[PDB]
């Protein structure tokens, strides 16, 4: 159905060009400048032939982009370049070799070439990223997180307070380096009350502007049809009433939370004097139990997920298991719409009908990053970076289990209307081309439109904004979105690697997606997407591990697939290559991953010496003790 | 062939009782007191109804035995108690249940009981051993190894010496804690010359005593028949001649080795002031490369294998791979005598012929611990403890691959004169009972005889000893022999676990071996077996891992075996139990193994504080700098 694929591709590229044209015409509008150029505002640099933004994105080379946006953004961007570097020679060599038992050994040696090239590119990129992280960490400005270690699960005491326990323990075991400490408070109730107050005040301003527009009183209890059994006829005095009562509530909650000993949760942020001391404390076991006096690198003040610091350490494992069970239920139940989509993958009616499954499946996977974020937040991780990484890992597992495996299994089952997977895989190339089309080129073209925050900005200005100076807060496009971004390229890696040595017709589409997404996300990191959390590109070990796992999966699927030719005898090679790949991954880990997982003491001391030399009048105690308190207690 | 088994057992127990009687009669001899009671001499406590040594061994409880012999010896002894604790309820329950598809589920639940009980006993013992190690480390006397860290693979410099590099680096990165350093020298040639001189002087004393006994001149060149093409008619002036020439050789070698810069190998022993500082340095990455400035806990001065400190770090991986290949060749080639023994496992001729395979196989496995020690020494490990542990691991791999697996495979092949392993395994119970008999009860009974060092002592006294005060050096029975000891119990664990849920007739023999070896080795640790190296029972993680692996092997073999009943449908349980065992092993690791692999800073500082309080006048620099030089340079 190459003609059907061509029709779908033409429709999608036309849609992408229309998206680009609409983006261009909106970009020239003076009143949506703050949404299409949200950065330079949070950075404070701006105030207020037709597709030149594409070549514009290619300026401002890597160091300037780093210091402009963040090493996290730059490395996540380089993921796309990694994809291109891997798959361009795959595309050329595989396409030329398979498209105009000798072909058997041809496939075998071809797969060896695939794996060797992928491993080499991964190794080179991994080394480069390690160098970039080390240099950036050495050159980073002073942050309170480089001095502070997070102490968890402090053992209880009968008559001794947590703060005194922490101070005494660290004064005994880290003399002439311990500076101060801060104990975490269980202020979840007060934070929730503050959020509720903010929402109620927003509603009050909404109805005040509604009254200004038209003098009328509305008696709907927050839903109109099946809301609360009341009226609140004017609702303005109503909102004034409960905002006042919750103001009294918040004042009270402050009164007891500032002095309730039961709110002192057994964990504390401990800050030392020198990054060397922090590195010493954060990399060594502290006491008898490996379950007491745990030490971890304390995240940035703007990074720490204050909500999850209240979970006692005893329940972390129970939450681990319950969320694993919930993930199992989700991925098992979610075969139903996958089956629906694959059935939809059953002339202007047939071609568009074959186009439909991509749209249907992508729509069914719209809210999933949010769902995964919610379950990971239910789990305790305490830092936005770790939350995003864990969500990305769970999302990649979901994609591998369902979007690929369940798709091919349901396709085989519907084709049949005991393992024929080797023949069932290849003719799903058409469905996978349709899906790569839609969730690739169309998805990115829609992404550049910034439609959701654009509509949010217009609606907020038109209905909710009552005073000025609030538009800067109104615009906040969020981070790059690692959790929703990188598992998609992981999935596309999987498709390319799996289908390359069997059906080479897939690869060019992935190449086009890589190029287009690279340019688009480069422009987006340049002009929008303020970063919430500043990691030092710490997710790269996870990315490299995922790529290795995808490579092993591709190799095993090839081994299974080549069983169609009777007595294949390819086992003594297709069982020897995957163990070689695992060994290479082990070597790459042991050779470079320490630069990501451990902090060298020599660099800690060198940075500290440079800092002391250049800033001999640093009030480090005053700088450190006042941070890590709480957002509400500020 | 239960009668044949009984005849073999009776013969072996009679042999064991004869061994015990001969041991008893020799133990009363005043002139072999130094060999049957070698300890109390290296410890300095002795000088110079019929089986009461068995109850005598049971006195002197665990703390006194610890401080008498060593925690390594006590823990290795407790391995036998671990075996008994695991396998006694296995014996009772399995024997009563299987000996007077319901039996199918009976087997399934029986295996679950087996695994659960074994895991529980392993967990309890693992906790107890962790507590013992922690308390003993906290209570140990002062040793130079607790202050010193071994720095390997120092990067080369153009015009800067290794000693100055080490001193400068540590004065920059560990201020107010670095005390002194010692660089390792490449004195292998000089040590070899000293050993050659010792051997030649021994030969000279031999021939001097021979001349004293009988005035004659012997013209054999060290072999008589096909030796060197010479005479050395008297050989006494001959030996004087070359001992003099090699004395000049050794003097010269000292002259150039003391001042040759090329002998300064890039590694150094660095000693700090406080055990806290040593723990900080020995547990953290030091610099950019994870392949430079490596830090490891420096072994004891009497432990360090000075020969292997001369291997440059670049060739360690090459040696790893070449020795893995050599191990593969050894284990693959060594099927030949295993096939011979299994063929020997084909009435006083038939019964003794069926007894023969145990003797033949045990004899063929006599020199193997020595061979494995030689190959591990060819590998670079630098410490006797690590050498013994690595040799034990390789020996356990050998046993699993050959003595069990190749035995059953060759037995199936010879019975046939495509996987019938499930039926081939059980009737090898007779061969395994014969082998457990021989290399168990007979082996231990022979072990108590101390025959080899006894004969060595008599021969040395009669032929080599020329003066007195050398008998104390003449007696040296060596360590407990962890490398040759513990993989044997590992193999017996494997047999018991594998054969218990299929053929319960094996277990009582293993129980008897456990009891007898426990008593015998307890007596031997009490009275003989000085310890070469004082580890803090650091091999227990290895032992526990080996037991877990054996348990998984038993479970998988059961799963394969139960396939004889058509459509067994036991997979949804026998694939779920092994993953549960792996998960339990992971939990046990993460919960206790840190006490063995990492040194808590709190304990380091507590020990240091106690030491400073009790000994305020410690010349630590003088104590530390003079150690770790070399045995020859003393």
Description:
2 copies of one chain form a homodimer. By secondary structure, chain A is mainly alpha-helical. The first copy, chain A, folds into 2 domains: 2-29 and 64-143 and 314-417 and 420-460 and 469-598, no CATH class; 189-257. The first copy, chain A, is 65% helix and 4% strand. The first copy, chain A, is built from 27 helices and 4 strands. The first copy, chain A, has a 4-stranded antiparallel beta sheet. In chain A, α8 (188-213) packs antiparallel against α9 (236-257) and α20 (482-499) packs parallel to α22 (540-561). The longest helix of chain A is centred in the first third of the chain and has 38 residues, at 102-139. The N and C termini of chain A lie far apart (63 Å). Chain A binds chain B through residues 134, 172-173, 276, 279-280, 283-288, 290-291, 293, 590-592, 594-595, 598-603, 605, and chain B through 134, 172-173, 276, 279-280, 283-288, 290-291, 293, 590-592, 594-595, 598-603, 605.
């Amino acid at each position: 159905t190459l003609q059907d694929i061509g029709v779908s591709a033409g429709i999608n590229i036309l849609s992408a060009f229309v998206f680009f044209i609409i983006f261009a015409v909106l970009r020239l509008q003076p009143f949506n400048d703050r949404v299409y150029f949200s950065k330079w505002y949070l950075k404070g640099l701006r105030s207020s032939k037709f597709l030149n933004w594409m070549p514009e994105a290619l300026k401002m080379p890597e160091p300037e982009l780093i210091d402009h946006a963040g090493l996290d953004s730059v490395v996540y961007l380089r993921i796309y370049w990694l994809g291109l570097k891997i798959f361009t020679p795959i595309a050329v060599l595989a396409w030329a070799v398979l498209v105009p038992s000798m072909r058997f050994w041809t496939h075998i040696v071809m797969a060896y070439a695939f794996t060797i090239w992928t491993c080499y590119v991964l190794m080179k990129e991994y080394e480069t990223i390690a160098n970039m992280r080390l240099q950036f960490v050495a050159s980073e400005a002073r942050r309170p997180d480089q001095f502070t270690v997070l102490v968890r699960n402090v053992p209880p005491d009968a008559d001794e307070s947590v703060s005194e326990l922490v101070e005494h323990f660290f004064l005994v075991n880290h003399p002439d380096h311990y500076l101060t400490h801060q104990v975490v408070c269980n202020a979840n109730k007060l934070a929730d009350l503050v959020k509720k107050k903010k929402k109620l005040q927003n509603w009050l301003d909404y109805y005040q502007l509604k009254y200004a527009r038209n003098n009328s009183q509305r008696i709907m209890v927050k839903l109109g049809f099946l809301g609360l059994w009341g009226q609140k006829v004017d609702a303005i005095e109503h909102y004034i009433a409960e905002i006042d009562k919750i103001s009294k509530e918040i004042s009270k909650e402050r009164e007891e939370v500032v002095n309730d000993p039961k709110a002192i949760m057994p964990a504390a942020f401990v800050s030392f004097k020198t990054r060397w001391a922090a590195a010493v404390c954060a990399q060594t076991q502290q006491t008898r139990n490996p379950t007491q006096w745990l030490t971890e690198w304390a995240p940035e003040p703007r990074d720490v997920f204050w909500s999850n610091l209240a979970i006692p350490y005893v329940s972390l494992t129970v939450r681990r298991l319950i969320m694993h069970v919930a993930f199992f239920f989700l991925t098992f139940f979610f075969i139903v719409p996958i089956a629906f989509v694959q059935s939809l993958a059953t002339f202007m009616k047939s071609v568009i009908q074959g186009f439909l499954p991509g749209i249907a499946l992508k729509l069914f996977l719209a809210f999933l990053p949010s769902i995964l974020m919610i379950m990971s937040k239910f789990e305790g991780f305490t830092s936005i970076s770790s939350l995003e990484r864990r969500a990305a890992f769970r999302y990649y597992i979901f994609n591998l289990v369902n979007v690929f495996l369940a798709s091919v299994i349901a396709g085989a089952a519907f084709e049949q209307l005991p393992k024929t997977i080797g023949v069932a895989i290849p003719m799903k190339a058409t469905f996978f081309i349709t899906y790569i089309m839609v969730d690739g080129w169309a998805g990115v073209a829609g992404e550049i439109l910034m439609l959701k925050p654009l509509i949010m900005f217009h609606l907020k200005n038109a209905f909710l904004v009552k005073t000025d100076k609030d538009r800067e807060e109104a615009m906040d496009p969020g981070s790059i979105g690692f959790n929703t971004g990188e598992p998609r390229i992981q999935l596309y890696f999987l498709l390319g690697l799996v289908y390359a040595p069997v059906t080479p017709m897939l690869l060019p589409f992935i190449l086009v997606f890589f190029a287009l997404a690279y340019i688009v996300y480069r422009h987006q990191i340049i002009n929008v997407y303020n970063q919430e959390y500043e990691s030092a590109a710490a997710f790269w070990p996870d990315v490299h591990g995922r790529v290795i796992a995808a490579l092993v999966i591709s190799q095993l699927l090839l081994m299974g697939l080549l069983g169609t030719k009777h007595a294949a005898l390819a086992a003594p090679f297709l069982i020897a290559l995957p163990v070689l790949t695992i060994g290479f991954h082990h070597f790459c880990k042991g050779r470079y991953e320490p630069a990501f997982i451990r902090y060298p003491l020599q660099e800690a001391m060198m940075k500290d010496t440079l800092e002391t030399a250049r800033e001999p009048n640093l009030n480090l105690k005053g700088y450190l003790q006042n941070a890590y308190v709480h957002p509400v207690f500020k």
